Design a protein around this nucleic acid. Structure first.
Length: 323
DNA sequence: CCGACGACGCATCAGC
DNA sequence: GCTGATGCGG
DNA sequence: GTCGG
């Protein structure tokens, strides 16, 4: 319908983020492309698009130029720009952000081949991101996410059957494919007012059975790393996948699951509704708001449904949290 | 006109 | 060495 | 870049 327009706007977003270091412009172009991508008519003019929330004067002017000519002069130019195209490309390496990509290109390091020749100048995260560059850009089919979940839940229970672990993200909402695996972990002994090896024990067990293959970062409450399904003796091996594991206090765990299940638009709507019912919900807690807007103490939450009950919402299955 | 636009854990750097 | 800032990813 | 107080 409008794929030329939303492709144009996405590409402009990337250069704002990765080259100009203008994160809010990045998000403006992304929000514009989203609302256009949901529009169920083929756009005929910039004025037509400008009536949508998030499309302003300047993007309307760009849509007019694209509709009249089939391209955008500024985008054509920055595409052919060796310096800018190289900075934009190098941020596809996990661990290389706009600042690192700038530094590398400044000193003549422009391609993956150049990075491979300059391992010295890459930190540990960036080396992993380079090692799995192609794998990390592949999506994960749901059937593999199910096999990964099998392993995660089994090994967690093997460490301590009192752990609770939930794979969240779009997978939990039923998505047919995922970009990564997001695991939320808690244990009855870990509360907000309460051991600095609860997460370590679980990471270690997944390493011992050779599911987790690399570590990008690891502290007492957050692990970011790499995993891979076991290959079947003779079949081609599975791509390496990104997995995060977060340990959350038990009394904050279901607020955590709700939040990291999303979707992002659902979260906005749920918190909007919660505010107009006199509650403030964030990633950690739901708290009542007094008549002058002072937040009270966090309310007890022992399930996701508790959160819905507080705000007078019928329980919504993750499958039905698209918005 | 002009400020908001998410907050935060972990790795690493800058400064002392 | 320690403390705070920055980069980065989510 | 867009929105809105």
């Amino acid at each position: 319908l409008n794929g030329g327009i939303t492709d144009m706007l996405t590409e402009l977003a990337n250069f704002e983020k990765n080259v100009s270091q203008a994160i809010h412009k990045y998000n403006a172009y992304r929000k514009a492309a989203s609302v256009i991508a949901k529009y169920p008519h083929k756009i005929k003019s910039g004025a037509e698009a400008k009536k949508l929330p998030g499309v302003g004067t300047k993007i309307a002017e760009k849509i007019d130029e694209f509709l009249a000519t089939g391209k955008l002069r500024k985008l054509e130019k920055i595409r052919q720009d060796d310096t800018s195209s190289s900075i934009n490309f190098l941020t596809r390496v996990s661990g290389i952000g706009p600042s690192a990509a700038r530094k590398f290109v400044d000193e003549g390091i422009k391609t993956l081949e150049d990075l491979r020749k300059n391992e010295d100048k890459l930190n540990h995260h960036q080396r992993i991101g380079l090692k799995y560059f192609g794998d990390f850009e592949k999506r994960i089919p749901r059937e593999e996410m199910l096999q990964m979940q099998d392993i995660v839940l089994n090994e967690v229970k093997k460490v301590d059957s009192e752990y609770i672990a939930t794979v969240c993200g779009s997978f939990r909402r039923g998505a047919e494919s995922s970009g990564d695996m997001d695991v939320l972990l808690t244990h009855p002994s870990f509360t907000s007012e309460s051991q600095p090896k609860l997460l370590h024990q679980v990471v270690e067990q997944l390493q011992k059975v050779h599911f987790i293959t690399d570590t990008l970062s690891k502290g007492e409450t957050k692990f970011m790393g790499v995993c891979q399904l076991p290959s079947k003796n003779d079949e081609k091996e599975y791509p390496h996948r990104r997995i995060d594991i977060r340990l959350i206090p038990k009394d904050q765990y279901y607020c955590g699951v709700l939040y990291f299940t999303g979707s992002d638009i659902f979260n906005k709507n749920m918190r909007a509704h919660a505010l107009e019912k006199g509650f403030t919900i964030n990633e950690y807690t739901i708290r009542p708001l007094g008549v002058t807007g002072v937040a009270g103490e966090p309310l007890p939450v022992d399930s996701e449904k508790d959160i819905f009950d507080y705000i007078q919402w019928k329980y919504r299955e993750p499958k039905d949290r698209s918005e």
